[PDB]
Structure formats: structure tokens, C-alpha cells
Design a protein around this ligand. Structure first.
Ligand SMILES: O=P(O)(O)C(O)(Cc1cccnc1)P(=O)(O)O
Ligand SMILES: O=P(O)(O)C(O)(Cc1cccnc1)P(=O)(O)O
Ligand SMILES: C=C(C)CCOP(=O)(O)OP(=O)(O)O
Ligand SMILES: C=C(C)CCOP(=O)(O)OP(=O)(O)O
Ligand SMILES: [Mg+2]
Ligand SMILES: [Mg+2]
Ligand SMILES: [Mg+2]
Ligand SMILES: [Mg+2]
Ligand SMILES: [Mg+2]
Ligand SMILES: [Mg+2]
Lengths: 341, 341
């Protein structure tokens, strides 16, 4: 259903750009906004934007799916894609990344640099511009504004947790626990990537109940934790030509799922190898950490976690999906299960 | 009236921090938010926050100024101070600044660096948290959310214009015109610093009329243009112990009011001196540009502009203040007239 809707969803980007780039004095700034939008909102899997589109089709009665209603749905999907673009442009600066989605990071582009900070905020500003342009007269207008605002705050608190546990130049092996990992990942990824697209479609379909949103959240935050674990696995063991980005977690002293599991299985001698080689820019030290991971059979430990966690998410769908069609959660789950990009 | 209300307004910051820093898992992130708030929202003149407080007192009938009403007013004032903090933390990174408000820029602090990007977004997130906590049940709640969102977009478009006209490593003397200057300054400063605090107080007082907001805007955008001109003058000719920040406009190849006037009065020989020495990090080249400014009597040209512009703003107050008390605009105008900090 995602694979089918992909070309239809991407075809609507042209309109999104047209409406956002429509006063001659700000001409150069609006021209730069188009360049920012084209570079940073295109090239990913569009899982978040498509989740809004697919979930709205499954939650709204077909006779109530008019052309204006469907336009609002993929506009809101594109708003989640812009939120993604905002966080990625800033995250690549802060993680000193090289590539994103098969091309050099926007801030690494000659002539951009730290101007990417303001470009990132512009991407965030376009969300509320589109919500005003297409959803201002709708009963769920305020619920969507607050949902996009709260999802941004939650991600930013998660990003604070990610950066505080990963100080440059300091050994922070003590703080790389399972409890700390779950808290980072819940806030930095699980809310905006999984709860936000489904919650937006739910509000657009008139499902605004506290209990329904709490039940959907129980499934989606677990799906999010699992998705970040896959992302951490891919940082080191994924193919950069497929993933589109070069890994930096070891160099960046990140509280990765991999380092958390390494610490749980490592011998005192192996702990010292990790202490001496983690969180440093040296290629030989990064190679040493990877060798330790492969030695502790961490790629196979990931295969077993992925199996066990997927069954747990399936048990959560069975418990908390009702009254929503289970396909809403199953579609996204199958889209991310056994991920390689 | 500003001078009197200053200590009262600053005394409320403790509550603002308490309510924003009130889940044990996010403890370290919330602790970092307090550090960000204390470092970056304190030390300025509080002109924007005080404008909300003073204007709300002058627009609302005293019998309608209850304790809850007054708390909402200085909370909204503090929301404008957080918007200021957000833009300043990011602007200092992008302008490669050293000091702000008498202390080293937050990003220049050891252990902060580019993590300041996420800290800046957290400051922006706190605005909407405070609006939800204190104004969610009020009739002007949505008008304030949209006003803070539109004022952020306008500033960001202004910041895009500021950065596009100031490329590092390129001579952009051709684009340093009066028409381009007016457009940068209108968007980057005039909207959020002058229109936003008065417009917020107007909405809180129930004055939501399009015509009234347009009349107030005509005065306040001119006041804003004037305020940025003073800021550009102070960048080079102000005392860093008084202003609290070290100037970077010449080094940063900025389209400053000073360089616009220099180009309008310079001889072809003087134009070449400017071409060869502007927009470069070399101390001897910056000293050369300053010498040219002093040679063209630019400090005296600023004294005359400040006089003529203040009379024009006074003519605009006389024309467009009604039905609002002129003291609303006069208070802010006298607070910024002959500025040195
Ligand atoms: O794409 P990335 O950089 O692997 C990531 O997933 C990006 C990201 C940005 C913001 C929130 N969550 C994840 P990260 O956490 O840095 O591993
Ligand atoms: O404090 P600054 O850096 O002099 C300034 O006024 C800061 C600022 C930030 C954002 C919008 N407007 C002004 P700038 O424009 O860089 O001269
Ligand atoms: C929140 C995370 C883990 C960042 C990357 O998400 P995606 O893997 O969905 O990246 P894109 O498809 O948008 O490129
Ligand atoms: C928008 C501009 C010109 C930035 C500085 O404003 P202020 O001069 O008001 O600085 P603070 O008092 O908040 O420190
Ligand atoms: Mg990151
Ligand atoms: Mg990253
Ligand atoms: Mg990653
Ligand atoms: Mg600037
Ligand atoms: Mg600056
Ligand atoms: Mg300045």
C-alpha cells in the first residue's frame, strides 16, 4: 500500500513547493527556500508522509474522502516530511555527518555551512504555513498545530538526551545503559516518526479521544524504539550506498544500541578495549570497536532482538489496535521490518 | 514606565523557569534546559517583554487587570524574550560572534559548541509550552500562536536575506543598496522586535481588528528599521563593555547601514579601498574600513538620520496611533531613542 502510494505522494511535492514559493523584495530568500526544500525534503523513504496518507484512507469513510479532504491529507503528510527535514539538517551538523540520502549533507555543501541552521528553521516554519493555508477552517486545526508543536518539543528533549550522553572528548561508558537508551530513543525518534503521522490522521478523521490516542501511542512508541535500534545497527553494519548516509556513532561517542549490548556481554579485558577506542575520530580506533562487536556476535544478537521485538509489537497491535483497523499499524510495521535502508 | 517595571518583570523569570523545569528519565535534559534558559534569556534590556507588559496595562481597563490576567501578560512578555533568545543563540553561531550581553556566546562556551543549535530550538519550543500552560482557555489563544509562528517565519526570511547578501569570501558591494537594506531589516528585525510585542498585547486586550493591526504595523515597522540602523551603528562605533557584544559586520561582509551610506558618498578611489578591505577577517583590513567611515563623516551622518527618522516616526504616531493611546508607541520610541546599549 506504501509502495503503490509513493509516486502519487511525491507527485504532490511540486504543488507544495509552488504554494510555499508564491512581494518582490523577498525574491532571493524565497528562491533559497525552494533550494532548501528540493535538497532536503526529497530522497528518503517518505514513510512518515505516506503513513498520514495511508492511515487517513483507512480511517475515513470513502464517501467522505473528497478531493479537498485528500489534498489536506497529503499536505499534512508533507508537513511530517518537513519536520523530518528540519531535524535531519540540524542533526547532521551536530553529529558532524558527511552524507544523507545518497548526497553530501546540506551544511557540508560549498556556500552553505552554518547558514544551514536558519535553513533548518525555515523548513520547520513551512509546516505551520501549510497548516494555515489548507487546514485553518477545519475543526482539527488547533489539534494538529499542538500535535506538531509537542512532537517538536519531545524530539528536541530527546536530542538533548542524545547529545548529553555523547560528550566529545569524554569517556561516558558508565551512562550507556538500557534504561538511558530507551529514554533517548523514545523522545528523539519514537514520538515524531511513529506516533505523530498516525495521530495526525486520527485527528483529521475526527478520532480525538484521549484513550484511543493513548492505545495507539502504546503500539507506536514500541515500534519507534525498534526503528531506532535498526538505525543504530545500520550506522555501523549497513551499506552507505543503500542507507545513503555514512555512520558516525562510534566516533561521536553515542549511546548506540550496539554499545549498550557490547557493555552487557564484554569481558573486563574487552571493556578496556572499548574504553580506549570508543568516542574518538581515529579510523584505527573505530575499526577496533567494530572488530569487538563482530567478536561478541552483535550482528546475530540484533537478528534475535528484531525477531522477539516484532512479535511483541504484534502482541501490542492485537491488544491496543481496536477500534482502529489493525492494518493501520501492520502496514507501517511490515514497511520497517527487516529494514536495510 | 519601562525602568519601573524592569525589576518586577525579571522577578517573574524564576516562576517561568520553575513551570518549564517541573518523568525522571528526562531529568538531565530538563536540567540542561534550565542552564540554556538562565544563560540565554537573561542579561538584555528586556525591551520586547516589557513592551508586552506596559502595552497590556495601557490597553486593558484597570478593573479587568486581575492577577491571572497580569500573569498571562508577563508570561507572553517572557515568550517574546524566549523568541529573542532563540534567534540570538543561532545568529551568534552564523555570524561567528564572540560575546553577547557581556558574556561569551553560548556556542563559544566549552562543552557547548554546535549543540547550541538544539538548545536554540528548545528556547523556541518553550514559547508554545507557556502559551498552552497559561493562555489555552483564552479567546486570543490561536491568534497568539499564529502571531508567534508568523513572526518567526518573517524573521527567518529576513535572516535568509541577511545571509544571502553577505557571502563569505565574495565581494557583494553591488547588492549593498538602500532598497535591499530596507527589505533585510524589515523582515529580520522590525516584525518580531516591534510589531510582535504590541500586536500580542493588542490581541490579549481583545483588539483583533485588521485595520488597527495594520495602523500599528505602519508605525512599528518604521521604528524597527530605525532600531536596526542603530544596531548597525553600534556594531562598529559602540563600546563592547556597554553593548555587551563584539562587532563582526565588516568581517562578515554584511549589508550594514554604514556600508550602504559609505557606498553612496565614496569617491571611485574610496570605493576601491572598501572593495579591497571589506568582508575579510584581517584586523588591518577592518581598521582600514573604519578609517574610511570616519573619513566620510559617517558617525555625524548617523546623528542626522537618527534625528530625521525619529521626527518621521513621531509623525506616523500622530497619523496612525488612534484609537490606541499614543503613549503605547511613545514609551517604546523614547526607550530606543539615542540608544548606546
Ligand atoms: O540519520 P541519523 O543521523 O542516523 C538519526 O537517526 C537522526 C535523527 C535525528 C533526530 C531525531 N532522531 C534521529 P541519529 O539519531 O543521529 O542516529
Ligand atoms: O545582535 P546582532 O548580532 O548585532 C543582530 O542584531 C541580531 C539579530 C538576530 C536576528 C534578527 N535580527 C537581528 P544582527 O542582525 O546579527 O546585527
Ligand atoms: C528518526 C530517524 C531514525 C532518522 C532517519 O529516518 P528515516 O530512516 O525514515 O530516513 P528517511 O527515509 O526520511 O530518509
Ligand atoms: C533584533 C536585534 C537588533 C538584536 C538585539 O536586540 P536588543 O538590542 O534588544 O538586545 P537585547 O536587549 O535583548 O539583549
Ligand atoms: Mg543525532
Ligand atoms: Mg545523526
Ligand atoms: Mg543513526
Ligand atoms: Mg545576524
Ligand atoms: Mg549577529
Ligand atoms: Mg548587529
Amino acid at each position: 500500500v506504501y509502495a503503490q502510494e509513493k509516486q502519487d505522494f511525491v507527485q504532490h511535492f511540486s504543488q507544495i513547493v509552488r504554494v510555499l514559493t508564491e512581494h518582490p523584495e523577498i525574491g532571493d530568500a524565497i528562491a533559497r527556500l525552494k533550494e532548501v526544500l528540493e535538497y532536503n525534503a526529497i530522497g528518503g523513504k517518505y514513510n512518515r508522509g505516506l503513513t498520514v496518507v495511508v492511515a487517513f484512507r483507512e480511517l475515513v469513510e470513502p464517501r467522505k474522502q473528497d478531493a479537498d479532504s485528500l489534498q489536506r491529507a497529503w499536505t499534512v503528510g508533507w508537513c511530517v516530511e518537513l519536520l523530518q527535514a528540519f531535524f535531519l539538517v540540524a542533526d547532521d551538523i551536530m553529529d558532524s555527518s558527511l552524507t544523507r540520502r545518497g548526497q553530501i549533507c546540506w551544511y557540508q555543501k560549498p556556500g552553505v555551512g552554518l547558514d544551514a541552521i536558519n535553513d533548518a528553521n525555515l523548513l520547520e516554519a513551512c509546516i505551520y504555513r501549510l497548516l494555515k493555508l489548507y487546514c485553518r477552517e477545519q475543526p482539527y486545526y488547533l489539534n494538529l498545530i499542538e500535535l506538531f508543536l509537542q512532537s517538536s518539543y519531545q524530539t528536541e528533549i530527546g536530542q538533548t538526551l542524545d547529545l548529553l550522553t555523547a560528550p566529545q572528548g569524554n569517556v561516558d561508558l558508565v551512562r550507556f545503559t538500557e534504561k538511558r537508551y530507551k529514554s533517548i530513543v523514545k523522545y528523539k525518534t519514537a514520538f515524531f516518526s511513529f506516533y505523530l503521522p498516525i495521530a495526525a490522521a486520527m485527528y483529521m478523521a475526527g478520532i480525538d479521544g484521549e484513550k484511543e490516542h493513548a492505545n495507539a501511542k502504546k503500539i507506536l512508541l514500541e515500534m519507534g524504539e525498534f526503528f531506532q535500534i535498526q538505525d543504530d545497527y545500520l550506522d555501523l553494519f549497513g551499506d552507505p550506498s543503500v542507507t545513503g548516509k555514512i555512520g558516525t556513532d562510534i566516533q561521536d561517542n553515542k549511546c548506540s544500541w550496539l554499545v549498550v549490548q557490547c557493555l552487557q556481554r564484554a569481558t573486563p579485558e574487552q571493556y578496556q578495549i572499548l574504553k580506549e577506542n570508543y568516542g574518538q575520530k581515529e579510523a584505527e580506533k573505530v575499526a577496533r570497536v567494530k572488530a569487538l562487536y563482530e567478536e561478541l556476535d552483535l550482528p546475530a544478537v540484533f537478528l534475535q532482538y528484531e525477531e522477539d521485538s516484532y512479535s511483541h509489537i504484534m502482541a501490542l497491535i492485537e491488544q491496543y489496535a481496536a477500534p482502529l483497523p489493525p492494518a493501520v499499524f501492520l502496514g507501517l510495521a511490515r514497511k520497517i521490518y527487516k529494514r536495510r535502508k
